[PDB]
Design a protein around this ligand. Structure first.
Ligand SMILES: *[C@@H]1O[C@H](CO)[C@@H](O[C@@H]2O[C@H](CO)[C@@H](O)[C@H](O)[C@H]2NC(C)=O)[C@H](O)[C@H]1NC(C)=O
Ligand SMILES: *[C@@H]1O[C@H](CO)[C@@H](O[C@@H]2O[C@H](CO)[C@@H](O)[C@H](O)[C@H]2NC(C)=O)[C@H](O)[C@H]1NC(C)=O
Ligand SMILES: [Cu+2]
Ligand SMILES: [Cu+2]
Ligand SMILES: [Cu+2]
Ligand SMILES: [Cu+2]
Ligand code: NA
Length: 499
């Protein structure tokens, strides 16, 4: 069952064995992935998060981010530790009370403390549209049509060296999959369809790092949503999905009744499908209960290319149709050396006082804010352009902006910008050497918004900056509840921190 929009959510430690290997984890709702949190567009969500964690090897504090939800007027509820709140301590709870006006689509939630979401605190978050403009394109859209793709590690996150190339031990599809080494024939996930029906498959990357080449043998996929943004229909036979991205696609159950492999090949870790790694099963009702015998093609003839995507609505692009054609045009210098990432020469290390609390306490320019050099102010009601030229080691880096979606004016592997009709999204691969992926948005959401690579190991190694959007209006726009004001005193007392 789905939970929400008003629900408790307990965060616990437990042993799990999603690939046959037992390890302890950090779980929401007792499962991996966590339960789907759902509601309708414009609903009030009140997710009261109970921190019941006791195992220090995965951290006993926590904080949860609602990925892709704008949090307008509720910056305090966004979740990134030391940007919008101090962590919740064990034995305490916290009500994330916010609204989702003007958004409908496929989202997710995850820990936003250190690399803790890798240890298991990740699940889907779906905002349905009762008047969806795509409703007539499918018959079925429910918890059974969500497909999660996850990397899974046998080593605990807090034992992963910072700045290292860290590699997973299994790909999990809907929570199940097989280990790359010492492979055992542990259970594979089954997605069941009825011959003749059309399904809205909601594909969610809950990855901490790899991108996946996702396909379904015998089937093609008609994209209708990208990171929450409705798209024109685009039919493909393969989707390369980067960490934290989401797609909805229509699956037409139009092939013979039978069993078909679902494939998710990561860019690192185990390559191929030997022993049923990187796999799940699409089963038609009435098929024999047995593994598929289907083949992938040698090459995919209609892969997703990001410039082929276009919004369903006439979203356009803000600003003027040339590089630098914005009120505030920025170019970030994105680098890596010696185990640490940097943006504009500064490696991100979380501050002691969350950025939002520094601003509410009266710090009002970005040079007054900590960490020094890690906060860039944005002016209000302005067109922002951010160029993100690639080249830093460990790519391709999927960059994500909190509080906003953005027009993808230039995509990976294509030097031509699009000032007319590019897709809007919230997490974008910045590509490869020489690329110049560029995003645009308008500043209508006061508060401090994190910008970072969504490979969680990279964020931990410093690949982040904070956009302090409309500092002067942050306090009036974002009134804070007493429980939020209580978080830093409680956290600092528990950890013997003076501030
Ligand atoms: C990416 O595009 C940005 C513009 O969006 C380029 O920025 C210019 O950089 C040159 C020096 O490299 C400066 O003289 C200009 O002031 C910048 N802004 C402009 C022209 O509008 C950046 O060079 C591009 N990077 C790559 C690798 O192609
Ligand atoms: C590279 O990106 C550009 C810009 O998004 C793509 O160019 C568009 O191509 C479409 C489809 O043919 C045309 O309708 C548009 O007029 C083009 N726009 C511009 C500004 O040129 C281009 O197709 C992409 N390249 C590849 C190989 O997909
Ligand atoms: Cu996220
Ligand atoms: Cu986010
Ligand atoms: Cu990265
Ligand atoms: Cu984030
Ligand atoms: Na425009």
């Amino acid at each position: 069952a789905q939970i929400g929009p008003v629900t408790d959510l307990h965060i616990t430690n437990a042993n799990i064995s999603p690939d046959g290997f037992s390890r302890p984890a950090v779980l929401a709702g007792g499962t991996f992935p966590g339960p789907t949190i759902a509601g309708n567009t414009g609903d009030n969500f009140q997710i009261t998060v109970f921190n019941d964690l006791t195992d220090p090897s995965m951290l006993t504090d926590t904080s949860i981010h609602w990925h892709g939800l704008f949090q307008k007027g509720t910056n305090w509820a966004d979740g990134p530790a030391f940007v919008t709140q101090c962590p919740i301590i064990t034995g305490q709870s916290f009500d994330y009370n916010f609204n989702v006006p003007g958004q409908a689509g496929t989202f997710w939630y995850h820990s936003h403390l250190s690399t803790q979401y890798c240890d298991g605190l990740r699940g889907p978050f779906v905002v349905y549209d009762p008047n969806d403009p795509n409703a007539s394109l499918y018959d079925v859209d429910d918890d059974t049509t969500i497909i999660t793709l996850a990397d899974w590690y046998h080593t605990l996150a807090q034992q992963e060296p910072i700045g290292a190339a860290i590699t997973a031990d299994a790909t999990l599809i809907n929570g199940l999959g097989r280990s790359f080494t010492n492979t055992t024939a542990s259970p594979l996930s089954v997605i069941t369809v009825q011959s003749g029906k059309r399904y809205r498959m909601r594909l969610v990357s809950i990855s901490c790092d790899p991108n996946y080449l996702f396909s379904i043998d015998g089937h093609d996929m008609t994209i209708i949503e990208v990171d929450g943004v409705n798209s024109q229909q685009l039919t493909v036979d393969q989707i390369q999905i980067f960490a934290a991205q989401r797609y909805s696609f229509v699956l037409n159950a139009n092939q013979p009744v039978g069993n078909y492999w679902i494939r998710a090949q990561p860019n690192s870790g185990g390559q191929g499908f030997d022993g049923g790694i990187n796999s799940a099963i699409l089963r038609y009702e009435g098929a024999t209960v047995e593994d598929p015998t289907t083949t992938a093609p040698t090459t995919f003839s209609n892969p997703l290319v990001e410039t082929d995507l276009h919004p369903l609505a006439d979203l356009g692009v803000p600003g003027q149709p040339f590089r630098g054609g914005a009120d505030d045009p920025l170019v970030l210098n994105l680098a890596f050396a010696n185990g640490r990432f940097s943006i504009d020469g500064v490696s991100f290390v979380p501050p002691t006082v969350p950025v939002l609390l520094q601003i509410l306490s009266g710090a009002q320019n970005a040079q007054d804010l900590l960490p020094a050099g890690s906060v860039i102010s944005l002016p209000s009601n302005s067109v922002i352009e951010v160029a993100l030229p690639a080249g830093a080691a460990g790519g391709p880096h999927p960059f994500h902006l909190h509080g906003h979606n953005f027009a993808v004016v230039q995509s990976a592997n294509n030097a031509t910008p699009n000032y007319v009709n590019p897709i809007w999204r919230d997490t974008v691969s910045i590509g490869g050497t020489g690329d110049n992926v560029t995003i645009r948005f308008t500043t209508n959401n006061p508060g401090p918004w994190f910008l970072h690579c969504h490979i969680d190991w990279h964020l931990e190694a410093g690949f982040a900056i904070v956009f302090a959007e409309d500092i002067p209006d942050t306090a009036s726009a974002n009134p804070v509840p007493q429980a939020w004001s209580d978080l830093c005193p409680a956290y600092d007392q528990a950890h013997n921190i003076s501030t």
